Amino acid sequence: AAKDVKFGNDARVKMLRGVNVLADAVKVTLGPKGRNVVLDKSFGAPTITKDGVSVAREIELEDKFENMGAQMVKEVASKANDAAGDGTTTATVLAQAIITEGLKAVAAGMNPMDLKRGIDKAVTAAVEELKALSVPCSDSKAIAQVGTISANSDETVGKLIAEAMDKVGKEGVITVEDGTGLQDELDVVEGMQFDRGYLSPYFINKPETGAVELESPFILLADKKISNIREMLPVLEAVAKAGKPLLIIAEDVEGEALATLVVNTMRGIVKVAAVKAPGFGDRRKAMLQDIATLTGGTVISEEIGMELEKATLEDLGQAKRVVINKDTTTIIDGVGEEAAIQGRVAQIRQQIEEATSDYDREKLQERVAKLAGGVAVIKVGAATEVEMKEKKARVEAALHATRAAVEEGVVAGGGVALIRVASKLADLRGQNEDQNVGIKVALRAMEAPLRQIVLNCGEEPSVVANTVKGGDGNYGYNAATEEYGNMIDMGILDPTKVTRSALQYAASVAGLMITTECMVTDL
Amino acid sequence: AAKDVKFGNDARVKMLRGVNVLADAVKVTLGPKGRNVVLDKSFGAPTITKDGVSVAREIELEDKFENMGAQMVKEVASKANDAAGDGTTTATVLAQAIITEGLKAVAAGMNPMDLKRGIDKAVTAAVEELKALSVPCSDSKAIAQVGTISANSDETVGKLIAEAMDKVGKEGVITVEDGTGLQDELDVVEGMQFDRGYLSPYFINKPETGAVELESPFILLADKKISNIREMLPVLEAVAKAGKPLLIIAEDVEGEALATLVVNTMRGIVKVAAVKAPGFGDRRKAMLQDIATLTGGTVISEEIGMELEKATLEDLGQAKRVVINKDTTTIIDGVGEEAAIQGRVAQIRQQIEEATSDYDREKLQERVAKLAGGVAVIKVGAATEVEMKEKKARVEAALHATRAAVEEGVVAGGGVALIRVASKLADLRGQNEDQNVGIKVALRAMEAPLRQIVLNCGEEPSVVANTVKGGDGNYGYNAATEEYGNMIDMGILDPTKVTRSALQYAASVAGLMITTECMVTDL
Amino acid sequence: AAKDVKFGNDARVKMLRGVNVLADAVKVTLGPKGRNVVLDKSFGAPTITKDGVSVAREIELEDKFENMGAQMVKEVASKANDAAGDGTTTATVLAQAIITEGLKAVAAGMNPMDLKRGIDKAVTAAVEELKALSVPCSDSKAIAQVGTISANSDETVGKLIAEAMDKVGKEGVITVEDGTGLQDELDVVEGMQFDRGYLSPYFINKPETGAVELESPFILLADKKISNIREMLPVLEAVAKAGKPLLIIAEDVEGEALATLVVNTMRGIVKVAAVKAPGFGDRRKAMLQDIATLTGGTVISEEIGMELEKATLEDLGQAKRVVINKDTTTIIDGVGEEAAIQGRVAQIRQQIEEATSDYDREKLQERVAKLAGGVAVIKVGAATEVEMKEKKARVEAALHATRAAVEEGVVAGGGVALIRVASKLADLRGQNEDQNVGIKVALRAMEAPLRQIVLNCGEEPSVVANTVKGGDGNYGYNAATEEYGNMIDMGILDPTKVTRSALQYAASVAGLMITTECMVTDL
Ligand SMILES: Nc1ncnc2c1ncn2[C@@H]1O[C@H](COP(=O)(O)OP(=O)(O)OP(=O)(O)O)[C@@H](O)[C@H]1O
Ligand SMILES: Nc1ncnc2c1ncn2[C@@H]1O[C@H](COP(=O)(O)OP(=O)(O)OP(=O)(O)O)[C@@H](O)[C@H]1O
Ligand SMILES: Nc1ncnc2c1ncn2[C@@H]1O[C@H](COP(=O)(O)OP(=O)(O)OP(=O)(O)O)[C@@H](O)[C@H]1O
Ligand SMILES: [Mg+2]
Ligand SMILES: [Mg+2]
Numbered sequence A, B, C: 001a002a003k004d005v006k007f008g009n010d011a012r013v014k015m016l017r018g019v020n021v022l023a024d025a026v027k028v029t030l031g032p033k034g035r036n037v038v039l040d041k042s043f044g045a046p047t048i049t050k051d052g053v054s055v056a057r058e059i060e061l062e063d064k065f066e067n068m069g070a071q072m073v074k075e076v077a078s079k080a081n082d083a084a085g086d087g088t089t090t091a092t093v094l095a096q097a098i099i100t101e102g103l104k105a106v107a108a109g110m111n112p113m114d115l116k117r118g119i120d121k122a123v124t125a126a127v128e129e130l131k132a133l134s135v136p137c138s139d140s141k142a143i144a145q146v147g148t149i150s151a152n153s154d155e156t157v158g159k160l161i162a163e164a165m166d167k168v169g170k171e172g173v174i175t176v177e178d179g180t181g182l183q184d185e186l187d188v189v190e191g192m193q194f195d196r197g198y199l200s201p202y203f204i205n206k207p208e209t210g211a212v213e214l215e216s217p218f219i220l221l222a223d224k225k226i227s228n229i230r231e232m233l234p235v236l237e238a239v240a241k242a243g244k245p246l247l248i249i250a251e252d253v254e255g256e257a258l259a260t261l262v263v264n265t266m267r268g269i270v271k272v273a274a275v276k277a278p279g280f281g282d283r284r285k286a287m288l289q290d291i292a293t294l295t296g297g298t299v300i301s302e303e304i305g306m307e308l309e310k311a312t313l314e315d316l317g318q319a320k321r322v323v324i325n326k327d328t329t330t331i332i333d334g335v336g337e338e339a340a341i342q343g344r345v346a347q348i349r350q351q352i353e354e355a356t357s358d359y360d361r362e363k364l365q366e367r368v369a370k371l372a373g374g375v376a377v378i379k380v381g382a383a384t385e386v387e388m389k390e391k392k393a394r395v396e397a398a399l400h401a402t403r404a405a406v407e408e409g410v411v412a413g414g415g416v417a418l419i420r421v422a423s424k425l426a427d428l429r430g431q432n433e434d435q436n437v438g439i440k441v442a443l444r445a446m447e448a449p450l451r452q453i454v455l456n457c458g459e460e461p462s463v464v465a466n467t468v469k470g471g472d473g474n475y476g477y478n479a480a481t482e483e484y485g486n487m488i489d490m491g492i493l494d495p496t497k498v499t500r501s502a503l504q505y506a507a508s509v510a511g512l513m514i515t516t517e518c519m520v521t522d523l
């Protein structure tokens, strides 16, 4: 079953109360003045983390309707999180701001659909304007700053991510592991990379994103392409011993060899992934060798013409970790030591000198970049297990945001980017008055992030907001030092991606909420 | 399930109330004036032990939030206990002191993160300063005193540990067993200890510490390295009979022999651990013989060239106990009697006289030390089973603390060490006022231990504290006699390790607690 | 019942709670922004507060403690209200601000005595500063502006005050009467005023103002003292008929006679007022005659020897209306012919010239002035009765503020003056830090009331206050304009007296409140 059915105003006030409890609990957290949130555990000491997300997860309300409103806006943070991995609190205060004024306009008699249309138009133009303002990332200091800011005042994690990207760039892979010990740790273990992916999609491991991941797997470099089972038999058994995945790098991923890997890993013996030697044709053999030199068992090449059978147990190689994905196959670390690896680099480096023509030169440089590009490993600091798991989360998000920032650039942080955008849209209008109110609702909500940051500092939102709007460009308020200045020069940046996402998801859920004619729920 | 979410001050007062109930219950206990704590049992008479730890284990509160605060600070004692095995009560009063003033500062409007930073800085410098003051251990009387003090006024256990370490030093192993009877008992049974560890990690027994432990096991001294199963067959079967572990001491741990042991003990027949004859090369055979002479079945040596096959049932040896660990393989007691053992010592003692050169001399002395170093066994006194199990705990902790004291030295007890350290940090400052308050919070909490000890005596904390701070060095208050004096001269010492641990774990948990923006718990 | 005695730190909070509740309601109302409030009536439709003063009356707190606190603050308002006549609300806000901070200081544990002392010191300094700041206000325009403000706002009311004031002069009495309505009429009634009062407070008529207005009173004049009521009575009876109050003038009554008269008079009820004949000695007699001339009645003298009893009602003259106030008694529109009166005046005037002495001259001047001055009346528009009453009250308040305002001069309103004063004040320091704190608190309090207006405006008081502070001289915020302009030019002036009164009153009350060692209540 029997349902309770309402109609009219009574659903709106319920929803609003529910989003207010959630948003108010979450938004404090934001702003450096407030620090942490505690999350209760059934056993032991509570968790202390500054996660807006951590707070949101705990919010559930008694009143069934208020709870619905809270769970709905909670979708804002989660989507912003999934999409950008940062800015969930920002997204939550934008949503509350849009929902609050939007529902007030509805109560005033304004058309919900028009209000939503206006909000949507403002957001569409705002995003375009955000792209126009955003400017790209810079060297490791800037990367560290953005990372720190995106991790909420962990400058350590910020530096790590910046250094990791400085090593491998975007190209190498960057990964995050629990720390070996209780320190932030950043080290490049020799990522060699090449363009495959996996021969069979059913090689996908645990990793849901659409990749595979092996830890300390063995690496068969079939240089020749693998003719026989016979050739594989020795390596397949070495991999049969458990915990050692096997990575097959044969001239191409086979039929013959591939088919076997699919069948064997299908029966739980020797889990195994296969990828071609890189490129085609001739360069393929040369590249398949670069992998051998890197993973330490240098297989007598395809270039040589020697076979997988030529390849042996010595041929087999090993690395702490290998991932095979959308990007590539990437070998992180290798049995071949830096001596061997860096030496291999020098070789190919001369190859580029030798090459008669530009084409051969380009192809060679491609190989050195792949083999020397490296992989960067981020170990979240540790001791105790709780803090270690927490810092790991921050490093993950900070990395995600910084990666986005590097691609298309970051914008002034501290909520100033959205304020500049809002001011540029002062003349934006819609098809009618109600649509115009919706536009204004959205532009007003765009000041909310800066205002909440200031409020958390213990300062006056309207005064600071008024002053920031007074200047222009990157002029903003540094909440850490409580001084005005150039946000970029002070290193307070936000990846354009997280700002854009926060705004779009906030407007999206807000738009939905706005129109509720009738509500139905269990008695 | 549905959650209750708070925010603001209300979490802090709850936590504080919870830590106060726990700390107040625990801290009495500390100080000789108060004696024991009783712990209720579901059946029979209650347990009487003076364990701060015993009291903490029983503390659980009705109010869910207060209980969280109690369970959190309870982590302080447990970690200090795991790390130093003593000073849990001291750690608990330091934590309460830091948490109390820290939360007051927060309520006053001070920045939690800065407060924590200040506390951390003070602790970092305090620990350095603690190392500067600490001074190393001395002969068995001093060892006994420190042990007694670390066991809370069991001077008996103190003497035992001191005597045990006087026999084997650190080098021998010291162990603790339930008493054979109702007395403190300390006896050296012939530890011969040589450097291995176990051939297979899969030999680890009960002792979670990564060692393996056998009681009255049989000792096969394969002097030659074991060629055949055949040679093992006789001893393996003798060990097949249950309760008799087998320890394989062959020229090195084998392949052949080792592989068999791994397989057999894998099938539950004859559990078995293997270790090399000590050293390499020539000395290996000579050392493998020292073990034979000690465990009584003197195997015809590898030095001789005779084999495991040479080795027989006579060859097999036996000892009350053997441990194979990080340190070594250590044989405690041996079938070879003291007559044989001490005689063997005399032999090797002349060997050292004979040796042409220093190298041969050094190598020989190494063997005598290993074979004569011995093992010391501490039997907690008994009758009844309850008291016996209790005294055993005290001896274990006292031993642990005294061992630490011997390594890097002890500091003045009675809480004076921390008071001296605090006075040396009077000019320590941080980046801002809030950080300075945090530093002061920590220095103030450093007086808490001495103050609680005095309070438990029925004396006035401020007066005694004031007087101790008035003097300097090892000048302190002897709570047993209620007289001031030189703490070291009066034999009131604390291992620097337990003092350091108590302070670090207290500051660590206190720092966490301090910042709670929001709290989430089940409805 | 028995009393519940509690300390009492709690006691402080309860008081704080009570004050806030009352304060909050009061604060909001103040200013044009402030909103309507109603007073309930047992019967009939509820009255209209509207003003804060009445607002306080309604508020009662259920909690005894809270209620008690609430009452105390109210007292501040009442006291300010009576003396100031205005600024009741202003005082309230100030008091609350002071109290809250003071309480917090109490929480601080700063010795509250110092805080109170510091506050007082600041107040004293402020008062002195304020006076200097204030500039004398004389202006038809100025008066009107003041009047308008008091009315909140009536230009006309101010106009009436100015007009009445001009005609009367400061010396001249101003009375307000309902007119036909709605019209503002200023007419000067002829009559004499002498500095006397009613003999018995029990003569108070209908005007609640502590006065007695008689319509067509019969006026009896005695030179002789009135021995007893009995003599009076026969006069009274004649006088009373019909429905006509009796006014009695006699030169003086001896205490002995007076006591009898008072007792008898008090016991009985009669409608009469008696005033001494003006002046002493012969002049008094002469003055009495003047009154008689004005009345048109004839004086009866003891010297004449005619008894009051002998004198009939007819003998007594009649006055169109008489009012008696503590300060003075007035006779208006006497029956007696102008010509006779004028001649009398002329004779007196000559008399003034005649007297050689200044002393004589002064007396002569006094006599003439009283007769000459007459009274002037202001008529408020009449009807509806409810409205008229309301208007009348407003007029009085405006007049009072104006009257006080004129002499001292007025200070710019908007609380600008308070802010200005505070800045100067800040430099001044208390004897000790606690006192200093108190001083600061007082200064802080001053700032608040400006904020309250702003808050009611809805403008962020912070910005306004900051801006206001920045401006020097007469700088202020005009709520209505919501523009910044000169307060004086704007013509929003708050009377010096009103401002001064409120501040002092609030401070006084706060001090008492601040320190309560313990609070006792009935259980
Ligand atoms: N220390 C800081 N000082 C000033 N502004 C900061 C600081 N740290 C972050 N910000 C700003 O706050 C906004 C959001 O970042 P932040 O990670 O702190 O919260 P969030 O991402 O919204 O919440 P969460 O990380 O839990 O999802 C950005 O505009 C960022 O520039
Ligand atoms: N007889 C004693 N007289 C004076 N001080 C003592 C005595 N025994 C112990 N102490 C002091 O008290 C502390 C250790 O005693 P105790 O073992 O009771 O405390 P604890 O180790 O904190 O409690 P627990 O052993 O249950 O963890 C040290 O600082 C030590 O110097
Ligand atoms: N337009 C205005 N701009 C600035 N301040 C104003 C304005 N109008 C009124 N005020 C201020 O409001 C106060 C006068 O109004 P009101 O009489 O209601 O206050 P009050 O006397 O404290 O309240 P009450 O008369 O009910 O006790 C003064 O401080 C006056 O300066
Ligand atoms: Mg973030
Ligand atoms: Mg102890």
Ligand SMILES: [Mg+2]
Binding pocket: C086, C087, C088, C089
């Ligand atoms: Mg007023």
